Design a protein around this ligand. Sequence first.
Ligand SMILES: [Mg+2]
Ligand SMILES: [Mg+2]
Ligand SMILES: [Mg+2]
Ligand SMILES: [Mg+2]
Lengths: 475, 474, 475, 474
Amino acid sequence: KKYRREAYHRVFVNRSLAMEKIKCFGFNMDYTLAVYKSPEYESLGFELTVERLVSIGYPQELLSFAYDSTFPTRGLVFDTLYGNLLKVDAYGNLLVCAHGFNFIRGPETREQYPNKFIQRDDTERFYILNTLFNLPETYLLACLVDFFTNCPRYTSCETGFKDGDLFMSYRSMFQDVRDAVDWVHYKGSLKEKTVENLEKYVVKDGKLPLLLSRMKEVGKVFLATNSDYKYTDKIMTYLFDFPHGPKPGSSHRPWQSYFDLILVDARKPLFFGEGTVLRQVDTKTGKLKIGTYTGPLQHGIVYSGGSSDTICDLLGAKGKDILYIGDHIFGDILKSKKRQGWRTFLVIPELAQELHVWTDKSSLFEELQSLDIFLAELYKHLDSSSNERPDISSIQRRIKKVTHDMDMCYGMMGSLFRSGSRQTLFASQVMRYADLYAASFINLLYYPFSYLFRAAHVLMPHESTVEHTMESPLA
Amino acid sequence: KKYRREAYHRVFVNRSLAMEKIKCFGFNMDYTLAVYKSPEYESLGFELTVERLVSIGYPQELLSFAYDSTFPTRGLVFDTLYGNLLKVDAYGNLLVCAHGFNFIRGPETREQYPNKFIQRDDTERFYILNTLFNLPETYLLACLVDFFTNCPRYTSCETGFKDGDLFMSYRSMFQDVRDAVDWVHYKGSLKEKTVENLEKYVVKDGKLPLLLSRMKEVGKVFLATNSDYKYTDKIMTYLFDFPHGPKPGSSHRPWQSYFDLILVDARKPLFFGEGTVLRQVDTKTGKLKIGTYTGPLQHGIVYSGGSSDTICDLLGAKGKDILYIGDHIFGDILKSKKRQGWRTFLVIPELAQELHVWTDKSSLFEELQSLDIFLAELYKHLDSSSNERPDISSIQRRIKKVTHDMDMCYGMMGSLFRSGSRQTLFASQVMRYADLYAASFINLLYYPFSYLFRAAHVLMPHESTVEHTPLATR
Amino acid sequence: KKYRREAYHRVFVNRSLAMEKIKCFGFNMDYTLAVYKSPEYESLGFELTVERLVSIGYPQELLSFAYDSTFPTRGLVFDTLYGNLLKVDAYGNLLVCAHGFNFIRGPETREQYPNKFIQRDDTERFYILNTLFNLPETYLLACLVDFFTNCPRYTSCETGFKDGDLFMSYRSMFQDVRDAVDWVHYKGSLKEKTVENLEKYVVKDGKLPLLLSRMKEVGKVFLATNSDYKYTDKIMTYLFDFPHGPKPGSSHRPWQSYFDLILVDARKPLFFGEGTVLRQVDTKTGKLKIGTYTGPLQHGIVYSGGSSDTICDLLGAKGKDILYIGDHIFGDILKSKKRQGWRTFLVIPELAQELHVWTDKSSLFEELQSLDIFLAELYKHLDSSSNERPDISSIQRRIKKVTHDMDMCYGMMGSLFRSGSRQTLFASQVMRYADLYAASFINLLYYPFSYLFRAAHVLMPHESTVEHTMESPLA
Amino acid sequence: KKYRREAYHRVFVNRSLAMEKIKCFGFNMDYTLAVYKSPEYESLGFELTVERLVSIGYPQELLSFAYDSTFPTRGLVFDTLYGNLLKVDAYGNLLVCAHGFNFIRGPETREQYPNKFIQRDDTERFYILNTLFNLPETYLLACLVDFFTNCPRYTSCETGFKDGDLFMSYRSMFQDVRDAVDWVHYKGSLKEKTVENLEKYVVKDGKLPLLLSRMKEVGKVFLATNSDYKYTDKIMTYLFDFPHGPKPGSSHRPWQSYFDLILVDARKPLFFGEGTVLRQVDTKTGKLKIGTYTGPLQHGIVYSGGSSDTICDLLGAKGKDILYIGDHIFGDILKSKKRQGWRTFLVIPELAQELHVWTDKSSLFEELQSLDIFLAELYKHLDSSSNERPDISSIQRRIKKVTHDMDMCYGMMGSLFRSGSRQTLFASQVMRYADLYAASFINLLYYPFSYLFRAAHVLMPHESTVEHTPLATR
Ligand SMILES: [Mg+2]
Ligand SMILES: [Mg+2]
Ligand SMILES: [Mg+2]
Ligand SMILES: [Mg+2]
């Protein structure tokens, strides 16, 4: 039995990585350093989207919607043609299909998805609700479908609803939701009401300055956020407001002092390709300077826009010397660039409450391995030369009821990573994108900066189920 | 603790499937029912390929190439620009790079692959050697690159070789190979020289009729082959040449009696699309009837062309009622069609010899496992508080040396499924396409037709490494 | 001698077009139906951009800039690396190169453009000021380069200016201008001050309702603008405010009655590809309805967003039955679409004042054809067997001075279509994009709707200079 | 009213150029100094190409193809997907579409080209037959398409032809043609069979030495050829075989005496890039010296490889001081390099025979011109006020019939420069690349080296159709 950190502190390794060769730690801000509290933050976002939808003309019944965190799972696929929330596997196959709040079973899925299959490439048809900000709109969409479906004033249709002489399609409707969320995030009052009560909305943890401290003793540390500087200063100042610096008794110091480079208005994902013009920010006003200091790496400066390359020049680093910590899954379309890629630490908040299910619901996992063992015993001496057709309909039904019992410990749309046997599309892009992942980057605090992160083998069927311990010539 | 059949007998399960709901069993012919022997069939293909390249104008020194089955591994990617054979992962990442027979260590790869990544979505540059018929040209490609790179009279360049004034691009060369193979399969003598010594080139097992007789007992059985009839009828005849039928003591019967439906000239994968026009075959002349028997089905008939939907109408079955046994992996583009798709049994010959390494080298698997444990012990009481660098350099080189030895027990280009901690593009295409897999379809013989095939869970780093026993919690 | 309409009324034909086969006339609004008066509109745009640049920190001397229409020619290329306005030919060759207000001659161009050549594909380096709205920023850029170049406070550099410890590059500076223009057009007060005094800014012509009238007697007529509906209603109402309808004595009627389809918020050029969702507009509020009427072509409706295809369905038309009148040159990247392309009428306002030069400055054209004739006479009997090297330096100098005398009748950056011998890049895309062109679409008023628009041959050197009236076997 | 030389003697001017500033004259060899005779050299190439395709495996009926110089026109685009030869305009637009020898009228083109447009920026689909060496395969391509489409034993498809079971894509076929040509030029017998009857295949004119002797008098003259030396030295020798030197009565002298610099094996267009390594050639053995004479220049030397910049250093001249005479059009990608580029003289053989139509068919040009006038008269007093449809249908069909007759005076695929009111992709590539053009470089003989070459204005619809005599004015 090999030693492993306690489960809640671990950094999970998809591809091996020698920490010693890391010269730079980069940081996302939103949902990486600034972990927005849950359900509270989603409920805020949700409410501001409903109100904005009502002001543009939506029916007042929407004001009755209250966000329910137990419904959405991140990563779902909205089908703007059929108004369905879909949980797909890595290869496009349906796992969960719910219309509004109505969960469709296998046989009925074949009416609209005759081969239980969607074409995820059809960017026109489907929208992947991949991001922690997409959480409220995921519930909102089910709500609106559930509402209009059950409200007498409207007639339900394959692709939407009839409202007298009018027709709101699930696709027209989805765009309203999408635009409203954009409006809430940009011209709206989300960042306003967030800053006006940070205790309510943003987690504060005092190990965060400690961790960034030791990072800077052994490497360079930078920040590259998409939010403007006025919003960053407010959120970063609160994350560092303690009556002491990194360790207690020591003097507090500004948050800018924990970074060798600070960049705002990055404009990710375009940041990683050509970029934008590299600007510098007057920190007094939070407004761009007209000129821009170009030269060596001196501090006090806050850069705006730019590109991933620009960061690499200023820090004096090759790509693979940069570990980049964040909450987003940047597509494999930037990996193509002949530039050296950044290493990756992906933050997946869900991980915490799912590692809980995994350790506290062990009774259900055991009941599954029992029926599985028992089922293999009923066939132990059966082959193609066997008449016998055992009765396994009730034990097949029990396996059906216990995985669903297990599926529901995660939420109404199940685990983020799997549904029963199959891995979800989301876990597929986690494995493709992320060298390292965990629930918070703060888990880096429990590993020496000399650590060797040796990845685990993702075993194939013939690899997990046969141990290392005359043949037909067809083999 | 649970029961599993002998490792070499097992059908391995990717997605679950209940056999009692299987009503039709369909069969590929080449490399499925007719397992071609190895290395002999590769060598014959390789030698007819080289003859053809020499017939076209290539230097005589090629006649001295002989196949070496220990080099090639299925699934490699030839970079026509820089003339390399690559082993890529599922997401485009270089695992192994060899120019000719010269293996390129990580640092060097950064010259041509600065980011150790290829856009496998670039068919004008890369050609994925996916098929069992691609092993010879995988090696032939490496032979030629090594030859033209070490032959005194040719000069090496980034993208090909100078023959004096004249310049041959690895891409131009690859087309010559790629067409020479096409020629050997389609216009040359391969199919001909195979029939004339079938006992050298084709495996024969009496378990095959036995297994197909028990299928016809509980369902309909069909054959959907890309080969023509003159060839199919020769190869199948041999496969059924025993002085007895299915069980021993029993009168032998014709191979055609084992299939409720026989279709040749399928033009798969166009078969699964619009297809071609359904044609009936004159069993005698080995050629086409002017008409076709549409409507109902009756035995004695041999179809040509058609589509996968034609088979579903004639067999009277829905898509998921069909289990299709074969050796090719048809991409995800044929699933999209609003038809109900077939359940799949993929045949992976390599599996037999790869299941030997996994069991007969349990000494390297256990050495690596001990090295990992010892590594965990050296960092047990370390965190970001401590700033000590334990010396892992000895441990590390030993790891890299044992996994390369484990890698070489598979062959010169590693295991068909993985290279180290990383899965190949092949393995990922296998788990995308295949419901069930095994070294031969014959393994179905060891299972009842009432069997419940329950998928193996493909665990994640945070599921395989943790027991069931506020910046994160939000 | 063939008959031709008087020069100011003509529609110029690049590719032949049978008007009889046109079932639909489509319309741009901004700078097509709403011709913004010049210099007045450019001066407005220019002033609002300067003020916005000053509020973000530009030096107050800018408030002294006054727009001068005699400087810019549409279609120039800004080089964000060297801060130069460039007038290029179809193939990338320099014609005019001015830095600020300083016009560089041949030999000095080879310092920065050693082969008198730019790579127009380098979208990062160069910006093509192709559009009638880009006019103010074209002068503004020369101004800012001229300013900072000559102001003691700044030091001039190859790629910008030093301002103490700072460095404003011509590329950083260009982005400020570009963003400011965007700001003026969108969140700014351009559309506000335009609507608040339409007599000042938008031409009113009473033949415009007459022309749209006869169009609708013989075909369907539609409008597809990028401006929102509140702005369209204001501009279209003024264009149609006369105390009478199409012909005088007749009753005035609304502008919406001149159209079979009205579409706003098109989002060209994306309009011509996949598009956006097709919405419908509540004309009372100028705000989108929640649902959208789908069905046959009934009137009173005003559609929003959509796609070129959507228009084709509703009008019942194939692509080549649609003549589309506008002021923009849509790239050849939408021509690719397997969709049938629209026919094109390109509006080029400049055409009016340039056809003026062509007819009023005939004395200069004649002086050129004289020196040209005279020059060919000095060589009449000269061949490779000739010692004689005539003296043509003063007549070469006169040709240099008269084309420049001619070049300047167009403006400080010369004609829009040519500079001396060479055609400009702009005329190249005019010929590629436009089936028909003229100074206003209103010239359609002088052609019957049965007219055959037979295009003119663009003659090659060996075609214009040899008439229809023993050889070396090398030919 | 102004003076112009005889139409067949003229250098035509695209951009202006003053000859007295020309210090170096450079020469291409094949199709420039060595004008290959027509149709004979096309036929020889065509026949060796077909022999090679039959040697490889193509049906014997090909041996009955014979070249027809009246079909092909340079600049056509072969669509490998649908097997068509296309004549496109400058912006990608179909002017003429022929499948085999079947010409496709507008309406039919809309099946395969719904928008009568091709993305010529798609080299995997289209191949632009730009060069004088491409005429044979232009016709060969059409021959094969027509053959396989009308041969009883082959079946036609959208994208190729079935040979029974086996399927050949027009794209696969095109590679066979394209390489068979490559073979004939590079490994076969073309260069060989040309030397053995030079008086059949290569034009000879005594004006050539005369013209090159007057260049060496007022500037430096060099030769930069892609051919090797054994070939260049054979072809040039013949070009200078007269019982006298430049003027008559004067001692003949060697061809090498006419060039201050001779460079073979140029590998143009890589020549204009980084290039290859500069090599000296042993004049005797026809092979390479182990060294190279770097530094200064002296006569007697023959260079190999190098780059365009090497020539500028050795000749001691800047780019715009060089006028480069040749028959190829090197794309806009070589101009971008921050070097000073060469002034260009493009040689367009076709020009001679096309300047005959323009002058000897002045009857159709005048009929069309009258039809246009009459058309203008029928709409003179019409505006959008009048709603009368005059009958133009008679006039219109006559126009379409006379321009097709004017089109056919050029050949079966129209004029090399235009089709009707529209310029070809060829013409636009000519006015992009070429400073001066003419049917042969020989025409320079008819001009002083002090001459001012003044560009012809390429007028626009609003410049050619209007004399110098408020919705628009803003
Ligand atoms: Mg984020
Ligand atoms: Mg097969
Ligand atoms: Mg406009
Ligand atoms: Mg040549």
